[PDB]
């Protein structure tokens, strides 16, 4: 009676959308993107600051 | 008898250009719809008998 089915929780299939029952998924969603933080800077004024 | 061979012709007149191009037929042969991502997915949805 046309079950939905599911991906085998196998990263290769879920990204492609390969399913087990019916209606292959279009694809995953996009929950967001994460990038590494920008490190901070130790203030230069501790040493000599002489613009040449 | 100053014939026309005494006269010297100047710049010849460029009467007409001529370029060669086929009757390009690709808008009318195939169905086109622009894609917004580097991978395009066309759905195929079918209706089946109880014998598939």
From Swiss-Prot, chain A:
Transmembrane segments: none annotated. It comes from the Viruses. A proteolytic cleavage by the prohead core protein protease gives rise to the mature major capsid protein during virus maturation. Major capsid protein that self-associates to form hexamers, building most of the capsid in association with pentons made of the capsid vertex protein and one dodecamer of the portal protein. The major capsid protein self-associates to form 160 hexamers, building most of the T=13 laevo capsid. Folding of major capsid protein requires the assistance of two chaperones, the host chaperone groL acting with the phage encoded gp23-specific chaperone, gp31. The capsid also contains two nonessential outer capsid proteins, Hoc and Soc, which decorate the capsid surface. Belongs to the Tevenvirinae major capsid protein family. Homohexamer. Interacts with the portal protein. Interacts with the capsid vertex protein that forms pentamers. Interacts with hoc; one hoc molecule associates with each capsid hexamer. Interacts with soc; this interaction reinforces the capsid structure. A total of 960 subunits of the major capsid protein forms the 160 hexamers. This is Major capsid protein. It comes from Enterobacteria phage T4 (Bacteriophage T4). The chain holds residues 66 to 117 of 521 of the full protein.
Curated annotation (Swiss-Prot), chain B:
Proteolytic cleavage at the N-terminus by the prohead core protein protease gives rise to the mature capsid vertex protein. It comes from the Viruses. Belongs to the Tevenvirinae capsid vertex family. Capsid protein that self-associates to form pentons, building the capsid in association with hexamers of the major capsid protein and one dodecamer of the portal protein. The capsid vertex protein self-associates to form 11 pentons, building the T=13 laevo capsid in association with 160 hexamers of the major capsid protein. Homopentamer. Interacts with the portal protein. Interacts with the major capsid protein that forms 160 hexamers. This is Capsid vertex protein. The gene is 24. The chain holds residues 11 to 62 of 427 of the full protein.
């Amino acid at each position: 009676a046309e079950i939905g089915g599911d991906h085998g929780y196998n990263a290769t299939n879920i990204a492609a959308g390969q399913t087990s029952g019916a209606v292959t998924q279009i694809g995953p969603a996009v929950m967001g993107m994460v990038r590494r933080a920008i490190p901070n800077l130790i203030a230069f004024d501790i040493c000599g600051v002489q613009p040449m | 008898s100053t014939t026309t061979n005494s006269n010297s012709i100047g710049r010849p007149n460029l009467v007409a250009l001529t370029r060669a191009t086929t009757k390009l037929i690709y808008s009318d042969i195939v169905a086109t719809q622009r894609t917004n991502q580097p991978v395009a997915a066309f759905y195929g949805i079918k209706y089946l008998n109880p014998d598939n």
